[PDB]
Amino acid sequence: GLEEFFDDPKNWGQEKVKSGAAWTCQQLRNKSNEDLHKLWYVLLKERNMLLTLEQEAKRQRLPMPSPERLDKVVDSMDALDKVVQEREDALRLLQTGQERARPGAWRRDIFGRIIWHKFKQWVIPWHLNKRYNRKRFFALPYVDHFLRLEREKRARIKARKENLERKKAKILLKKF
Amino acid sequence: MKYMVYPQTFALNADRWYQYFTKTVFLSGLPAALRAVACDCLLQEHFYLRRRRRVHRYEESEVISLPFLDQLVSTLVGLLSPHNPALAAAALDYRCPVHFYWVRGEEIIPRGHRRGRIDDLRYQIDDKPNNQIRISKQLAEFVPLDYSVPIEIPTIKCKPDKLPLFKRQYENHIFVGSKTADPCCYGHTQFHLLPDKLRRERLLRQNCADQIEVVFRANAIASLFAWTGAQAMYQGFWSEADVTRPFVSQAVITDGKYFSFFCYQLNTLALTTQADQNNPRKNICWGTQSKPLYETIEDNDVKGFNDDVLLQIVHFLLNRPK
Amino acid sequence: ANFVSWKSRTKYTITPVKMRKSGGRDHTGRIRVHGIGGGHKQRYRMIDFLRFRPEETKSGPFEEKVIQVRYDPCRSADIALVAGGSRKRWIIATENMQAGDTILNSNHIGRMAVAAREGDAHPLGALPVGTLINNVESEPGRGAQYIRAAGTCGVLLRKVNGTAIIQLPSKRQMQVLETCVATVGRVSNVDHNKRVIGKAGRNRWLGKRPNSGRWHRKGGWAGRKIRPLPPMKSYV
Amino acid sequence: YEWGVRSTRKSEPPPLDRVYEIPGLEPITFAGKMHFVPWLARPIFPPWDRGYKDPRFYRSPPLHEHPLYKDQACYIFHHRCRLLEGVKQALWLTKTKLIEGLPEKVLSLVDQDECVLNVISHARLWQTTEEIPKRETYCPVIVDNLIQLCKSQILKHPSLARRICVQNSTFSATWNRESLLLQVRGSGGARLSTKDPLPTIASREEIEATKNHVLETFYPISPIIDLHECNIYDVKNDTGFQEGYPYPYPHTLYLLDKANLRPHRLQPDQLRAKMILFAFGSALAQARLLYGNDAKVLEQPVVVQSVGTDGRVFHFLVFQLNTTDLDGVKNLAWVDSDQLLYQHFWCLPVIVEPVGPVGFKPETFRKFLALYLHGA
Amino acid sequence: ARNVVYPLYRLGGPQLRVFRTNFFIQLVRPGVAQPEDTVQFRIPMEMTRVDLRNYLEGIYNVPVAAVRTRVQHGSNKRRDHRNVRIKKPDYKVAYVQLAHGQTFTFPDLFP
Amino acid sequence: LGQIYANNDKLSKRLKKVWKPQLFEREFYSEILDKKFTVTVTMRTLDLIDEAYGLDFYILKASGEDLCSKFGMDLKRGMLLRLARQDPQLHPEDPERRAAIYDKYKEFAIPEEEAEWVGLTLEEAIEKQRLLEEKDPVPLFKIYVAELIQQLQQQALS
Amino acid sequence: GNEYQPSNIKRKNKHGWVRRLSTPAGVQVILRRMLKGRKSLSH
């Protein structure tokens, strides 16, 4: 029912509602995948409800009753995501021995800076793909100069940073 | 710019809204050779007639059904020309358009440079009735001019735009199957087929199973009403110069299996707020629920063929202008 | 500079093909030919200039019926719709050719030297000396390139060995192989020459933009040149 | 000469890298990577084919290997096929005789106009919302109206109840001639079907008479000329219905000629020819259905009618089909060519002339009525 | 799920599953005074009408009769101490009709 | 690509000039490759070939900087490879012939691994290297299993 | 005045990222923009 998008009717108009802590990583880590899935859906609905409440508050010009709870929920969700993801990664490592799922290949584009070109997934092979051969992954001589310039710029910035730090240190020393 | 009314609408609870727009009262119920012919018609398209190119579900209601419907119309008419001499004289139109333009209600303009200005909000029903039978003599009355029937019309608690209903500005159009220079200005049996969008299977798939009948009802309310309006216009009559006669017309929407039967009673064109204030009149519509003309076809044999449906059709056809 | 030439139709057809205008611009997009453009819209009728080509899986001399004689917007001469056997085609119309008429196409290099009629095509070897001809090929099987304009004609001057000598519409003369085809008579729409344009508007319609205002001085070239005719050119 | 032009023919592939000629080393190419590179040689990949079979990117086999490709070229007729000539060509194809007037029986079966006028008016002005309806609208409409009017005599004639006009009605018929194979395909027009067959117009003596006059030759415009030359044709003939369909007997082919442009429409002779062909084809199909597939001179010659097209002009045709063995006696069609109700309709008035039709002649209408009646 | 690579469906392979949904929603009071049975949600831009229908039916066990989405432009005309255009985010609104004459009035929170 | 003074006085005008070699197109049979290569070949190249007698010899002898072409380099590499492998260029029925051919070029003939890399660009070389050491990443699970096995063995020993 | 007559399609065809990437000059333009650190590198 749509009553799931709102909390307990008792809690409407309290200014403060009791919500005890977020799911920590270790606890989450120790629950099972089936359990975890179930937990996710429980979390989700709660999150939705919180969002709705927030929206209502905004509409009303009134402050939230217990906004920290939403944050906690979010944190919990994040933790859950991390745990499951970690597990998946581990599994992948065990099976194929691959870091990440979605593959790439460290490709040097037009502008010469090396992109992690994440692969896009589709039906025909590359050599008879019209829109992918026009995507060029090589520099040509004019780019090198620009790269050099960029590098120089970067170096300048670095120098500025370093010198500034030193100056600050000196100032501090002088003070104390 | 006017609210573009669609008789065969996907909108839910469209009926009440439609009624409000029109100002109707809807009510339940009405105010062997033939059978064989019907069976033959059913068969022809579904079996006997060999298709060249392959038939598809998107292509089903166009290719199979409309022609069958047409056949039913024409053959039936031929049969009943002895039974009724008016249908011999009466013209018949396949897919010819029907347009009608009314004004129902006021609206203070919400925003812009025209804000806080009275705007009489406009409607238009356009239509292509699968086919229709147009007579020169006007049909009878059904129910008397100014019949009370105290059942009450829907509210319209919110804006017309809240229902899926959209405004546009294109040429205004009040028009029957033909133009003014014509003897055959009246009519008595509009046939519709619902599109592929409002197949009952689709409805079932969606949670809207209560809106199966509703759609048909809405359609009946719309197209018929429009036709009536057109007829009225062609014999003078406005909002202000209200109809003296009761303009009547009948119709039978359908689907390949499922038919239902709808007569319309047009007592008013006085839908503007200027006229409504002193208005005891209201337009009427009576109709049956969608009963299947038949169950199913296996090869070249209908499983169960319903004669009751056929009888209704015959009745609709067979009524005369007094 | 986008420029796909419209001439991309590989298959022969009778149907008239949509013609893109050039304006006198090249594929580079610059004007190479001044004073062109802005005329009436036109469609191309594909003209079969290889007069003796046989219909598919046949070899002998090809008879033809004239179905129609029409105006071609693409050119000065008027054109004829020929039919024969299974196939139809457009040819350039000879003078006086009308619908219903029957035409002959031949490959037959006769030692008899058979006389011919104003519509029909023959090898030059079969044609009597002194007959007027049009749509003359340069080589055998090459296709008819010469004497195609409204009202024009060349005349067969003599035969020497396996070659014939033609006088072109410019009286400059041309030696052509005996077996090369031509069609007897003069090109149709004779008196095209006598047409008076009447107004600038007509000229514009024809797709000819006006001359430039810049006053040029006349130079060395501009005196009249009385010369002998250039030496008869051969293709053997 | 070679039409095509070099630039617009697909670009010639760039020359194969010179390393490939050297036997025998591994050419280092950009197929190791998955992008193009200008240094690094061009790789040569094998011709890819797809494992699964998507209909939305389906590539068919060549005309060499198709499941029913024949070597003898068939020649097939259509609604679109519009033949150079003419009535004569059609006759030749069909093997038949053209008589200048409709038969006497039909005429007799005739022996009022306001209705016709109304119908005409309705088609040419009244039916649509916009002013002046176009031909793709009115031409079929007029015909339909006429048909309806004819039907309105069911009160007069009780036998008219046992018919049905149908719209899609595709069909086929295949035969040899000189001998070259020859085919007809179905309609894009209406078809009046009846339970009883039509009666014979000509006697068996008359048919014997036809033998004397030779079918016209007309060189060099040979048949088959304009018809669609075709391989992969399939020789099986076909009526428009499965077995057991009531109202199976083709009374009149109500085909029509819409097309708002002058070019897309038929020219009248061509139209007539087409009609004749249709008549033959349906008749032939009927004959096939009736008798064996083996050819002969017929005992009962089947009759089919076909009205001509267009809102203005009307070509009537009744076809007798008496010989399923072509290549002796021949068939005998008769036509009333280009008879026409009403010359020109003024949808708007003029500045003097009214807004109705003009030059209305009811003879055409009468003829139509007669045609409709034939069986009863 | 939002911000995820979707697997390719070539022709006759498996049904696409979503275990663990990334997008989450919020039902709101309609300002313009909607009719009975129409519930309005603010939705992530990546979510489809169909997805919304599915999402409600599965997780909330609600009978959805119709869904009509609509993207809403968030305002850009707003500037800072720097005179840089702050943009309100564009967002998607749904108008979801409930089935079987279920009906729904939005509750009075913050009484 | 240079400049010329107009009539070879410096006080006359200076104007740019491009001096082109006189190019040709000619076939060359190469004993080591057993194939006829059509080549763009200047007169100078021909002369060089004549001097070194064989085209193959020229290819071999000519120092990489001297040779002046990518194609030439490639050819040289191929020749080297052939020399190394001792692969059948003349197939069977000509082993003696093959041997004889080989004996013509006992000079040169570098180890098989070096001759692969000969006459390459930098980028090409890099690509080759990449190809050589690409592989699939080995499953960590397998490694773990191996480790476990080792541990077990150790335990058994002790 | 009023020499600008906005039309998005034209603009994108004229000055767009794709057009700049098509030519070496265009590429250089983008590189220049990058080097300056400009926020909008193409149109």
Place this chain on the structure above:
Amino acid sequence: ADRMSKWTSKRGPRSFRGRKGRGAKGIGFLTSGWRFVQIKEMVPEFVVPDLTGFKLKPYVSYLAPESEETPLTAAQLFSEAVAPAIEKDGFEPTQEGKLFQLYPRNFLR
């Protein structure tokens, strides 16, 4: 003509506006007379579990004690399925013939 503002589906002309979309992800293809073909398999159906009789609430009591964190590496996982190996003294060589592929992911989320 602001090129600081983000390009979007609202911004162009008619033909431009209908092409783009937001990050919506397509349900099907389109054919014939622009008739769209909603394929069931491309639509993601949400596999929702049964929460009836599920004690895990969305928050965790303050009385619950804290523990030291442990990043779940592959080694640990292996160890947690090393008992069988030990007993002997559970792996795919390829997972191409498999519905749920761990590397080039099929499974959504």
Place this chain on the structure above:
RNA sequence: CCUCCGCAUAAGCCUGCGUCAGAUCACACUGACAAUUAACAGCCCAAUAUCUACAAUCAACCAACAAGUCAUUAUUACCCUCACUGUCAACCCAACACAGGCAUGCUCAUAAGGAAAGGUUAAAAAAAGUAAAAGGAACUCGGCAAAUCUUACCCC
């Protein structure tokens, strides 16, 4: 009292007089909060072959010329249905809340849509209009401008 203007669509722009709260010619300016729902319109169409002579002009006569804008067919291939986007506004290009510029469809006095006059006075000079005795081009470079109109003749 004006209406030499209105409603739409296209293009363009992109929340730019909607609710509440707030401040400082007269009080569309900031902050929050709402808002535009598809059927209209965008977003198309599996191959290989093979076909497309007869304009448009109420298309009927006439009548032409500058020679034109709307077509299939054969065989093979095929069941899955309505996704995604635009849809606000007093609006765009002209630095401006600028007498300018701005495509098409309707409406041709408007059923739309506006306000020429902050208040007084009634001087000069200036601007726009109307008035005119008698004369009537005498004005002036020239009947320029104006109000009634129309004669004859040169030059290019």
Place this chain on the structure above:
RNA sequence: GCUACCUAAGAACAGCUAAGAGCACACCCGUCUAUGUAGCAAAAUAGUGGGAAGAUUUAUAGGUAGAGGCGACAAACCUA
């Protein structure tokens, strides 16, 4: 994206007289006068005019670019 010219594929032209015809709307241009001349405006307003079924006007998309383009030469126009 202004203008110069072109290519593609669209659109508009009432009413009266009777054909690059006449009068005359809408549109196009800009003769002469007055006002304006830091202006309503970096070329406008008011009137008065030339054109207005054509060598016309014009919405959209494309093309030619500087030692060049484009030009019914005015050494015009090529974003004040």
Place this chain on the structure above:
RNA sequence: GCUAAACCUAGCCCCAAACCCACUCCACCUUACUACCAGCAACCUUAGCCAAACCAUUUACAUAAAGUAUAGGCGAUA
């Protein structure tokens, strides 16, 4: 007495030393920031201002030898 004045510390400059930068997910060469279908490809002396009081050959781009030998409208200058 109003307008205003004033105010150090943001940071920056020049060295030194050391070889830098660059995948939370998703998107991004199609009209970039767009989930999903059958064809091309990069290299080619710099010039001119200017100086020679104009202007055409011509004019630079660790220390010491050395501004030496040489070059050069045998001059500017190199």
